[PDB]
Symmetry: D2
Subunit: 326 residues, 4 copies
C-alpha cells in the first residue's frame, strides 16, 4: 500500500458540536490522529501518517500557513507517496491554488474538508477523507496539479470554488469542469488542467518569509472609494477589484485604482460574478490604464496569482502574461 | 381591441449602446406595437457600473408617482447592477402593476444581438395581467425572474441571469408566460419602506473576506461614519479575524453590521460559527452582499437596532 | 409540550438496504423522538426500479384513509422512481397534511451514509405546520422539493434531487425551514383524480426518440391496446419520422398520445414544429416522460378526448 | 485566411417562420448559400465554401447521413483547412459523437446549429455560425476530436448534450465541462478530452453501407417489456436500456434483456438520468448477465458507440473494454 501523509490544518472536518442534530459547532478542535482513527477503512488502501501543521478555521488562513505548507511538501516529497491536506472549506479554494502554483513535488497533493462537523448526523468528513486518500494513492493523479477532492469528485486547484454556503456538494469547477469522478474507490480521469502548474511555474517560495501585499475591493452601486484608498495609503503592492459584470468598476473606485497604477501599484480586474472570465477588450482599456484582466480567476484566486507574480515582476505587461499562462 | 399602455423608463446599459435614446430603442422593435401602446422616457443614460442612490430614488419616485398613468413599466438598464436596482425597487415601489427590468449582454450592433427580443419579452411580461402582484421582475433569456433572488451568474453569457436559490417564476414562449411561482418574501406595497420624501439613503459599504484579509477597508468605512457595513464573508458568512475584530467594535459603537457571503448561492444563516446576538450582527440569509446592502440601507431608514434589522432580514 | 404524530410508510429503497424493516429504520435515528411521535408501517419492501401501479394505488388509499389518524406522513422510498411516485401522490392524495417522501443515495452501512439525516429532515418537514397545503414533497440534501418538478439529475450524487425548472420550495437548516415558494399547479385536493375505488390504472407506455429510431416499440404498445403512449421526443418534443407515423395512426384510432422530451429541462410546448391539433396529440409542458405518464394515466381515468387531456396537462 | 468547408444538413439554423415574434416554423428550408451570405463577417476570418449534403430536420437524422458525413470528411480532408457542419440541434449530440469516433481527418471538425429560426428576432444562428468558423479556423482546435460550438462555448462531441428544450444556452458538457470559451473571436482552450477519438479509434466506416441495428428502451414504474421484446423479435444486434438511477431496469425489462443477451444480443445499461455514469459494481452483476455498463454515455450516445463496437465484436467483455476507452 502507498505511504500517504496527512497534513492537518483545521476546519469543520476537525470540528465538533454538542448535538448531532443542531448546527452550531466550533472548528479545528480534534487532532489528526482522531480523524484517521475515525476512518478505519483507510488502512485498506494506504499507510497513513498524520502531522498537525496548524489547527485553525480557514476563515483565518494566511500567508504564513501557505508558505509553511509549500515548503513542507517540497521538503518532504521524497519521504512519502502522496499528500492529503485537511483544511477548512471556507478558503480551501485559495490554499489549493497557492499550492498549485508553488508545490514542486511531482506526487499527488490532495486537499479535503467537510461541510458538516464530525459530530453531525451523516457527517461528510469520513468518506471525504477516504476518497481524498484514494485520490492521493492513485498513480493517475500525479502531474495533474494540486487537487481538491469533495463529494466523490476530483477538482483542479485552479478552477475549484465553493459555490454554496451549506451544501455538501458545494465544491465545483464552475468554468471548466471536474477532472474525474470517484466510484467504489476508483477514478476515471477524463481531463487535466492545461494551465501551467507546480513544477511548470517559476514561482519559488522556498526562501520567502512573506508575500507581497495584495488586497481585494468590492464593486456595487454607489461604491465608496475609501477601501481602495486605504489599501493605496498603506502601500499595498497590488489590489484586486471584484468588479461588476465583465470586470467593470464604479467610477470612484476606477479613478483611485487608475491613479495608483501610475504610481506602480499592480491592479488586477476580476469580477464578483461567480462564473466566466474577466476578459480583455471589453469596456476597460487595460493597456491604457496599466491594469491586468484576471480571466476566469475570481477575486481571491486572482489575489493568489498576483502575490506570486509580484515576487517576479511589477510590470503590468509581464503580469498580464502571467495571468494568461497560469 | 385595445392594448395595454406600457411605459419604458430608460437608464442606459449595453441594451442602449448607454448612448442611444429611448425613442431609438423603441423604433428598433416595431413588433412592440402588436402587443402594447409604448411610451418612452429617458431617466438617465449611464453604464450601470455607475448606478447610484440618486438614480434609485428617482426611479422609485417616478414609478410611484406615475402608477395611475400607465398599465405597466419596463426599465431598460445595464446588466452589471440590474440585480441591485431590481431589489431596491422590489422594496420601495408601491405600484402593484407590473414593473419589469431588462438589459442586453451583447451590443445592439453585434451579430445575434439579444436586446431586441429581450425588450419584446419584457413588454410581453409587463403587459400580462398575471405579472401584477409578483414584485419587481427581471426578464432575460425568455425567463421571468423575481427581483429578490435574481443575480448575474456569468460575465458574458446571454443566459447569465438566474434566480440561483429559488428558481424562476415563469418561462416565456410564443409571447405567453406560464407562471408557476411567486416570491413569498414581502415586496412592494407589503413593505414599510417609503422613500417618497428622501433625498439620500443611509451609507452602507461592502468589505470582502479572503485569506490574510486586511482590516483597512472595514476601518476606512468606520472612520467615515458609515451607517452600515455588509461583510462578503467566506463560506457561511465567516470573517477573517482582523475584519471580525473591526466589525465587532463597529457594531458596539453604532454601526449596523450584516454578515453576507462571497459564496454565490445559499444562505448566510444564524446559529453556525458566529454568535450574532453576542456581537450585535445580522445574518443576511440568501441575500448576497450587494442585495444585503440594499436591504440594510432601507432598514436603516426605519431602525438602528440589530434585533429589528434581523427581523427585517427575516421578512423582506 | 406535545410533539406531532408522524407516520412513516416504508416501501424499500437503499435507505432500507430494501431489506431492513421500518422499526429498524426508526430506531437508527433516536433523535426523531426529539421532534415527533413516530409510528412506522411497512407497505412493501422493494427496489423502486420495480415500483408499479399497485403500490401507487395502495399508498394513495392508505394516506387518504388514515389522514385523520396522524399529523403528517413520511414515505421512505428508493431513489430511482421516487420522482414518479411523488407526482402520482401529488395528484391523488386528498389529505392536506404534509406528505414527504425521502430516500438515500448511499447504503446505510457505508461511510457518511446520507439516510439518517435525510430521514431526520424529512420528519422535520412533515412536522412543520408550514409544510401543509404545498402538495406532496420530496426532502433530500437539506432541501424541500415539490413532487411535480423534482427529478433525479445524477446517477450517484447525494445532491441528485433537484426541481430543475422552477426550483426548490425551501431549505432546511438547524431543523427549521424557510419556505419561499409553493407550486402554482393544482395538486392534491384541488385535482379531480380519485383513485379510492380503482384496482388498476389505464395502460400508458413510453417510447424513446433518437437518430434512426425504430417504430417497433411504439407499434408493440399499439398492438397491445395501450390506452396512452408518451413520447420521449428529441428537443422540443419532436419525433423520428417512423415513430411520428405510428403515433399519428394510433392517435386517430383511440390511443392518447403525449409528446414529452428526453431533454432533461424545459417544456415541450405547443406551437413549435408539430401541429398537435391536426394529429390529436397533447404537449406535456415541463413534465418529463415518466411524469407525463403519471398524469396521462390519471387523465385517462376521466377522459379520452385530446383537447380535454391537453387542458389537464395545462392545469396539473 | 484558412479555407473552411461548410457541410449543410438542415436544422432550425436553416429554418424560417412567417413572423419574427411567433414560435412556429419549419426546419431545413434555406440553402447553405443563404446562411453564408447572412453572415458577411465570415469573409473577415475565412474563405468559406458551402455544400448541401442533405436538408432535413435532425429529428429525422439516420445512419445513412452519418455514413455520408464521415466518408465525405475523410475523403475531402486534404482539400480544406477545417469543416463546419450545420445541423439540427435535436440530435446534434448523436451525430457529433458518431463523427468523433469515425472521422480520421486531423483538421478541426465543428458542428453548429441554432435554437431560434433564422427569421426570428435575435436569431442565434448568425453568431453561432461565425463562432463555429472561428473554432474551425483555430490551429489550436486540431486534435481535440469532433467539436460542437454553441453559445460562445467549444464542447467536445462525447460529453456535449442538449440540456433544455428551448434555451439558446442549451448545449452543455454536463459531466466534464467545456473545452474553451470564445470571446472576441479568440478561444482560450483549457481542456481536451482524454477518451480516445478520431484517428485513435479502430472504427473504420469507409466501406460500410449500413450500421448494426441498435435500439433504445425506456425504464420507469410498471414498464412494459413489449418494446424490448419487439427489438429482440426483430433480431436487433444491440439494445441500450435507458435505465432508472444507476442504470437499473424494471424487472420485466431486465428479464427480457437477460434472455436476449444469452442468445447474443448486445445489451448496454445506460440511464435516463441526465448526468453521471452508469457504473459497474452497483446493483447489476453485468458479468453474470453479459451486460455492458455505459459510463457517462447517455442512451443515445451509448447507441452510437454500441453500433460501432458491433462492427468489431459481439463479445460483451470486449464491448465493455470499448466502453471503457472511447
Ligand atoms: N469555518 C470553517 C468552514 C468549513 O470548514 O467548512 C473553516 O473554513 O475552517
Ligand atoms: N457595463 C454595462 C454592462 C451591460 O449593460 O451589460 C452596464 O451595466 O451598463
Ligand atoms: N435501486 C434503488 C436506488 C436507491 O434506493 O437509491 C431503488 O430505487 O430502490
Ligand atoms: N427540429 C430541429 C431542432 C433544431 O434544429 O433546433 C432539428 O433538429 O432539425
Amino acid at each position: 500500500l502507498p505511504n500517504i501523509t496527512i497534513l492537518a490544518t483545521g476546519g469543520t472536518i476537525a470540528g465538533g458540536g454538542d448535538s448531532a442534530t443542531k448546527s452550531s459547532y466550533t472548528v479545528g478542535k480534534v487532532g489528526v490522529e482522531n480523524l484517521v482513527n475515525a476512518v478505519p477503512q483507510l488502512k485498506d488502501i494506504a499507510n497513513v501518517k498524520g502531522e498537525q501543521v496548524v489547527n485553525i478555521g480557514s476563515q483565518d488562513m494566511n500567508d504564513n500557513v501557505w508558505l509553511t505548507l509549500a515548503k513542507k511538501i517540497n521538503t518532504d516529497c521524497d519521504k512519502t507517496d502522496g499528500f492529503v491536506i485537511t483544511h477548512g472549506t471556507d478558503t480551501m479554494e485559495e490554499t489549493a491554488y497557492f499550492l498549485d502554483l508553488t508545490v514542486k513535488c511531482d506526487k499527488p497533493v490532495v486537499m479535503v474538508g467537510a461541510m458538516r462537523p464530525s459530530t453531525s448526523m451523516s457527517a461528510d468528513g469520513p468518506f471525504n477523507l477516504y476518497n481524498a486518500v484514494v485520490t492521493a494513492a492513485d498513480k493517475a493523479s500525479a502531474n495533474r496539479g494540486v487537487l481538491v477532492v469533495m463529494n466523490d469528485t476530483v477538482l483542479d486547484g485552479r478552477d475549484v470554488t465553493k459555490t454554496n454556503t451549506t451544501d455538501v456538494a458545494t465544491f465545483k469547477s464552475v468554468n471548466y469542469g471536474p477532472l474525474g469522478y470517484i466510484h467504489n474507490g476508483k477514478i476515471d480521469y477524463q481531463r487535466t488542467p492545461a494551465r501551467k502548474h507546480t513544477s511548470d511555474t517559476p514561482f519559488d517560495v522556498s526562501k520567502l518569509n512573506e508575500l507581497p501585499k495584495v488586497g481585494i475591493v468590492y464593486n456595487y452601486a454607489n461604491a465608496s472609494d475609501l477601501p481602495a484608498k486605504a489599501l493605496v495609503d498603506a502601500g499595498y503592492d497590488g489590489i484586486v477589484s471584484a468588479g461588476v459584470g465583465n470586470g467593470n468598476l464604479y467610477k470612484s473606485v476606477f479613478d483611485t485604482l487608475a491613479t495608483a497604477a501610475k504610481t506602480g501599484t499592480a491592479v488586477v480586474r476580476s469580477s464578483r460574478v461567480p462564473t466566466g472570465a474577466t476578459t480583455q477588450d471589453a469596456e476597460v482599456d487595460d493597456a491604457k490604464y496599466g491594469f491586468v484582466a484576471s480571466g476566469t480567476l475570481n477575486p481571491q484566486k486572482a489575489r493568489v496569482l498576483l502575490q506570486l507574480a509580484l515576487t517576479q515582476t511589477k510590470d503590468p505587461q509581464q503580469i498580464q502574461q502571467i495571468f494568461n499562462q497560469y
